[PDB]
Design an enzyme around this catalytic site. Structure first.
Site, PDB file in Angstrom:
ATOM      1  CD  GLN A 122      -9.058 104.789  26.138  1.00  0.00           C
ATOM      2  OE1 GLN A 122     -10.089 104.355  26.645  1.00  0.00           O
ATOM      3  NE2 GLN A 122      -7.849 104.244  26.243  1.00  0.00           N
ATOM      4  CB  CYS A 142      -9.341 102.920  29.581  1.00  0.00           C
ATOM      5  SG  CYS A 142      -8.338 101.416  29.695  1.00  0.00           S
ATOM      6  CG  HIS A 202     -11.010  98.953  27.747  1.00  0.00           C
ATOM      7  ND1 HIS A 202     -10.196 100.000  27.359  1.00  0.00           N
ATOM      8  CD2 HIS A 202     -12.321  99.331  27.619  1.00  0.00           C
ATOM      9  CE1 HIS A 202     -11.031 100.982  27.028  1.00  0.00           C
ATOM     10  NE2 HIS A 202     -12.304 100.627  27.165  1.00  0.00           N
ATOM     11  CG  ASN A 259     -15.486 101.899  25.848  1.00  0.00           C
ATOM     12  OD1 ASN A 259     -14.512 102.209  26.526  1.00  0.00           O
ATOM     13  ND2 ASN A 259     -15.482 101.053  24.821  1.00  0.00           N
TER      14      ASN A 259
END
Ligand SMILES: [N+]
Length: 218
Positions: free
Chosen positions: A19, A25, A162, A182
């Site tokens: 990202q 996110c 997150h 992630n």
């Protein structure tokens, strides 16, 4: 329930994305799970647009690169009647003008979304057995930022900030873990993923079990 689950082995997880500096996110996570359910139901894995959510999905406290909520990502898809692909509406890591022609081009749909009962790792495990699930964790500490390998145990708090996606779980050496996708590129963690301590109670490690949700496609 099974003792091992890994959605990568089922062809339901798109390769790791990055990202950058934009705080989108929330979009990364909602998209990863929609990609997963679409594969499960339709049999075809398609990489979908985080950019479209950033640009066209602003609502209430979900404001593009400024931050937002996983569920507003699902809600955008629902209210819009669909989402376009990563190739058609690529990611720029910027807050941009919603491109309406691309917003109107819809390839994948979802029908609704559900929240998993918060702070209940057993309920979360059950949900992960059927599809990838979106979660948020507290990724503010350097230990999290610095993670390179192993089953992460902390330190980290539980005030989530997150969003990420759980793609499986397993146990190794008697230690239970969750497998997390992630959006920090393949250079963080184990090729972009993290194994994090499971079955600790309450909000879970880094609050991973405190706010899970997943999209539903009948
Ligand atoms: N779309």
């Amino acid at each position: 329930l099974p003792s091992y689950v890994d959605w990568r082995s089922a062809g339901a997880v798109v390769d790791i994305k990055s990202q950058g500096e934009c705080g989108g996110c929330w979009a990364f996570s909602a998209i990863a799970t929609v990609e997963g359910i679409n594969k499960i139901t339709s049999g075809s894995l398609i990489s979908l647009s985080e950019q479209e959510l950033i640009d066209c999905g602003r609502t209430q406290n979900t404001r593009g690169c400024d931050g937002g909520y996983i569920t507003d990502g699902f809600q955008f898809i629902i209210n819009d009647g669909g989402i376009n692909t990563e190739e058609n509406y690529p990611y720029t890591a910027q807050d941009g003008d919603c491109d309406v022609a691309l917003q109107d081009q819809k390839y994948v749909t979802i029908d609704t979304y559900e929240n998993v009962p918060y702070n209940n790792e057993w309920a979360l495990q059950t949900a992960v057995t059927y599809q990838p699930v979106s979660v948020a964790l507290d990724a503010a500490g350097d230990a999290f930022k610095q993670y390179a390998s192993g089953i992460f145990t902390g330190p980290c708090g539980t005030a989530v900030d997150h969003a990420i996606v759980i793609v499986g779980y397993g146990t190794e050496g008697g230690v239970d873990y969750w497998i997390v996708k992630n959006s920090w590129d393949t250079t963080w963690g184990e090729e972009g993923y993290m194994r994090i301590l499971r079955n600790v109670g309450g909000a879970g490690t880094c609050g991973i079990a405190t706010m899970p949700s997943y999209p539903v496609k009948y």
